[PDB]
Design a protein around this nucleic acid. Sequence first.
RNA 1: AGAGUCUCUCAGCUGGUACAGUUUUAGAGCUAGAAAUAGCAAGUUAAAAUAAGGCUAGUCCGUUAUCAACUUGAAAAAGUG
DNA 2: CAATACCATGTACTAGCTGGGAGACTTC
DNA 3: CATGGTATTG
Length: 1333
Amino acid sequence: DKKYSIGLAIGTNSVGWAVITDEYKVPSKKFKVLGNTDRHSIKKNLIGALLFDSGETAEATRLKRTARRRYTRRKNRICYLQEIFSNEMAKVDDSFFHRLEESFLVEEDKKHERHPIFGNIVDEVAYHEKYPTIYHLRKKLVDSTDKADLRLIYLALAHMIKFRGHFLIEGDLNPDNSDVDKLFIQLVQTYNQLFEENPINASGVDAKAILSARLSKSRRLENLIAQLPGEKKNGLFGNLIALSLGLTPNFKSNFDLAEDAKLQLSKDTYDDDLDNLLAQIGDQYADLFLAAKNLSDAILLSDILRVNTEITKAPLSASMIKRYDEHHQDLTLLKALVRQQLPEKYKEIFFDQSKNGYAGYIDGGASQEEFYKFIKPILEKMDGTEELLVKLNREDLLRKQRTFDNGSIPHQIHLGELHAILRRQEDFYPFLKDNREKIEKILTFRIPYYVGPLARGNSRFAWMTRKSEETITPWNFEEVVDKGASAQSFIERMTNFDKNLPNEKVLPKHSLLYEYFTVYNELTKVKYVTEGMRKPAFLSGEQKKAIVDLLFKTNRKVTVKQLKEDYFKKIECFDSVEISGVEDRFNASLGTYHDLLKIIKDKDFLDNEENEDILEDIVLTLTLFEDREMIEERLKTYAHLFDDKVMKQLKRRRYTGWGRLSRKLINGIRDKQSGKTILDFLKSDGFANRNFMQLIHDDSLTFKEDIQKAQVSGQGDSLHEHIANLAGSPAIKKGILQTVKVVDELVKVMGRHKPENIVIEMAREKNSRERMKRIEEGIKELGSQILKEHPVENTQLQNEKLYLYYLQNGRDMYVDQELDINRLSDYDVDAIVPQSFLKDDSIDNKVLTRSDKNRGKSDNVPSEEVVKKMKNYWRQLLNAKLITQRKFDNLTKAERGGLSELDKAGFIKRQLVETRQITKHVAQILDSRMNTKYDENDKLIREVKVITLKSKLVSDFRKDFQFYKVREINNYHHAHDAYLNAVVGTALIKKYPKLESEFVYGDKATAKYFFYSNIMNFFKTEITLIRKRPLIETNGETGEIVWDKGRDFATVRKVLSMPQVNIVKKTEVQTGGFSKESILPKRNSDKLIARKKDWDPKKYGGFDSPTVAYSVLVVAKVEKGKSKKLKSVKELLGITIMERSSFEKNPIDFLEAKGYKEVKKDLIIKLPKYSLFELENGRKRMLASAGELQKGNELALPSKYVNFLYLASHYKGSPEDNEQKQLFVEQHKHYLDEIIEQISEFSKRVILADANLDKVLSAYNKHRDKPIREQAENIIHLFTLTNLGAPAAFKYFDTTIDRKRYTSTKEVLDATLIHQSITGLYETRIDLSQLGG
RNA sequence: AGAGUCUCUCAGCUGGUACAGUUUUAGAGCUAGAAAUAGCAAGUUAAAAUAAGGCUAGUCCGUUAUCAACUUGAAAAAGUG
DNA sequence: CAATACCATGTACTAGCTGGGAGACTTC
DNA sequence: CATGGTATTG
Ligand SMILES: [K+]
Ligand SMILES: [K+]
Ligand SMILES: [K+]
Ligand SMILES: [K+]
Ligand SMILES: [K+]
Ligand SMILES: [K+]
Ligand SMILES: [K+]
Ligand SMILES: [K+]
Ligand SMILES: [K+]
Ligand SMILES: [K+]
Ligand SMILES: [K+]
Ligand SMILES: [K+]
Ligand SMILES: [K+]
Ligand SMILES: [K+]
Ligand SMILES: [K+]
Ligand SMILES: [K+]
Ligand SMILES: [K+]
Ligand SMILES: [Mg+2]
Ligand SMILES: [Mg+2]
């Protein structure tokens, strides 16, 4: 009998809720209170907001999981090696591997001698004197022919296997394969071969030192080009060198090309970009473009190998030894220099670990970069440091061997030294000869990504299947693991099934049948009309077939121009024809047909339908698999059909991506009477030319019937599962589930009566590192030198104007002029589509220009004149990916007619009608839970209307009727937003029931522009642009009242003024990492936690700062003093995340191990983070941990102070209304003192931070002569003192007030504990003072 | 609304791999002093751990999601104002 | 104790699938 | 970043 509606505000950290009646009033009930206190009930307003910490994604958990596997597998590699060495090492040294295992232990805990390698000090000291680094020993074992100690052989091989290098380069690799000098001359060889008239004199050019110099790519290009007179860097030879150096040269101008041949070897799409370039100028230049790829491999290896390969087979280890020797020489020189010239600074540089000198660089925590910054002025100030300063700016001064840049090293280089050492010593140790390939396999073998974890039924992540049930090793992997089935399962466990045929897997996106389907589906809706024709006609089956054979099978893309001339003129003899159903060019194309035509060069083979299954199977293999060996294995059934050259070219062709329909749907099932498949109808369908949508929905065909029969709906998801499968951030998905739980409780509160309406609004939704990468790639592709002229860091790009300055290459976007980086404050940021139409404030709709006036007119998109002169410059930014296609399309829309009136109408509509898919899902979830009954026609009975609104409706409502929000005052605005949503939503559909189609879930341009722009005017009494409306607005047809402008605004004002709002902070057990990850040094402190069971932190260091999973109230006795007399206690024990499983398995045994005796087991209270306690005078506290509290109260500032703070701070309409607001501020200037008074009384009652409050009062009394706006702006900051939750720092003007913390939880042990339901309407209060023996 | 296609873009989820960093130990400090300390020499490398750990013992698993209280119940859940 | 201060693992490469948003062609 | 852990200093 009692009718009501529900308003909801779904956020990432909050769910606001409110209940309203017919009169837009919020009810209030007496709610029973449970527990052991005086209070049996409490009065609650039916409005509030649930607060919760953000839901986290799974990414961090995944990165730690895979890192965990890599540590386990890296250890296994060492275990494999030691198992091979086991028997023979036992003869040489029967405890060598035992000393390595216990190297970490202190001598007290060591069971063997403390020197690992040899077991005595004399041999150990001699080893280090001969091999100061591991790379000295590695080089010796590679070069020497003498028999070596088996322990030194193990150390070298283990070092290579434990740190084996990356796997980014496929195939084999030998140093001196790519000598820069010998690969540069080969480039000059093949260049002068193709250009006999224009040759290059490369004599006297030291190509080795110029290209391998540790300089920037462009500088080395300029250096080499400077050595070639009459040759410019943008010429052909310069573009080849630039391609070898890794730049992005554009070969268009070299070969007078129409297509832009922009090449970069680094991209995976290169070898196709070469063939596009090779198709235009021929294959004679393939020798040239291949000689450059070789030279690039030489220059890359020259970065790693800085040593002449003709003296050693260990160029990497020799290069590390080169680091060591120059480090030794330069350190000797630096010490001698500093001792003579600056003797007083010597102790600071070489002894003080706290400083970034050499001591802090070797012993302290100073990095190479910090060390260079500390010592660069010291070298500049002294004399004789010129060579050291050169090495510093090359980042080659006093280098270590284990460094951050060693990620460049490929595993083939470590393998080369490993293989060489095995070759040297297998002559002396027979077991090395028999295990040479095994040891090499330990280094080279990696688990394929398409195989995954090698589990045996206990991994929810694994999909691998085994050919035989036995332990998988690197040597039996091919025999035990079914790589074929595993790699197939890797994709097929992720790919969609056909929704129409749920048992049929979807075709590959690049399958020939799929592209035939996409072309014929688009082609069948084309229409044409000529002179003699009465009306436009479809294309017949013969015409479509002719268009496919003549155009689609001869051109990769088919434009409309080609359709008019190459078919309608050549075949139909039409001089003029109008085409509909396609613009500019056809979207679909037969790309795979042309890919295979170039590879196999047999057009008749591709056109013969008998080969359809073979070609579909080939593309499937090329799509399913990425490993070229597995691809070759699958294609070997067709080896008899193609030459070996074609089979090799077929292997290289790989496809990714899957379509959305299955082969059985496209060309499998047949219409019963016609006997035709879907594709058959697309090829020919009389004169109806039905397409895919029409065919599967036509009742005169059997396709629709077979689709319904094939549907198989399985087990239903739970609510949580269904929400987890929604497409959205895990953060917003947390709010969605909480929203459903809130509604369930609100319905139970109303006696299981369902509401009339549910109105929902859903808020709209490192980063600087991506911005630098977007500009680096952009400027490099652009070829600009703006980063050379103006360097920048990633953090600076967070400035909106500077980020736009670089994305625009330092130029005005509307004028062909360059901008001044030091004058960005004078320039303007302009919206491409005006913000009055499109509320988009992203970089994608913004532009940096000198003056926004130059955009043209301000009521539309940039003018045609700007487009005519800036289109070429914008397209360069687009190709440089400095602007998106959408940004380019909006910038150029005026040449396509600009913003039409329909576009403006849609823009206003999209400001008010929510169309996000995630909001429709939330509406569908609530709608399906509320409406479950069906009527006589078996159609759903919609008792509950689920309405979705956008935030702009209420925010406009708040500003138009002075119901302002100030988020920093308290959390009430989340609840107030929900209330206003219910009021505005219900009143909107009451006034206009026709709008239910646009706002309720379930199944002229100037007119709609006017209509949707004036839709919210029925709330207003007068409307300028200067009409007037009645005081009472009613529905036109029903006559029912929807809004009373003399009594309903007062109701809304009373609701927003109610001080009692149910703000509930969701209590949550803390999960995640055990503690801080930092491995601290040893110290005498019980805070340290052992990193391993037997690693006493007093000897070994460890962790501290553990996270408390939840606190536990313990009432027990503890032993006291030397006598151990039992003493009754009541205290909070924080159970850490690491301790949680032990505590929950047996709580009494866990507590007794902590010291507690006679634990009152039934009085143990689980207290998660944010547990609520009430003390005296309404003061509340929340549990931050076991030893710290948070603020637990809300400051219910009266509405008059909130509205004043909004208007005074300029948180705005007609000028006279602005002056009225300005007059109201100065008339009520005394509100500033009353606001401070409200803060002071609240703070003295519940905050209890005497020093901070006195500091606040002094700061306010200090700036009383400041402007009212500035005082009001800084009063907003003061509410951080009174905000709910963790104390935080804030500054009033220029005075900073650090947070006052609640560093003790003793007082809550005698306070009242409050258990709240999700809405806080149901409470259980426990007087904890009644506990304690 | 829904569906297929084209172009661009953003996010979610899974797998494979590398480089550092840190921690303890090893890399004989010397000399003058009873010591306190001073003067000087030296430094670049390595082993091992990298969530404690778990049983299911795999070259597997261990940081996401989900969680007021109470009554049942082993739990799964349901119920309670 | 209270006030105060300091601290917090990071980078790089790479193979996929799925979904959301924007504009456009065709449809139910 | 933010805020809970930790030590230091009175
Ligand atoms: K109602
Ligand atoms: K990754
Ligand atoms: K010992
Ligand atoms: K070099
Ligand atoms: K030159
Ligand atoms: K250091
Ligand atoms: K190191
Ligand atoms: K098109
Ligand atoms: K593939
Ligand atoms: K053959
Ligand atoms: K300006
Ligand atoms: K959690
Ligand atoms: K030492
Ligand atoms: K939990
Ligand atoms: K709760
Ligand atoms: K990706
Ligand atoms: K996409
Ligand atoms: Mg481990
Ligand atoms: Mg290390």
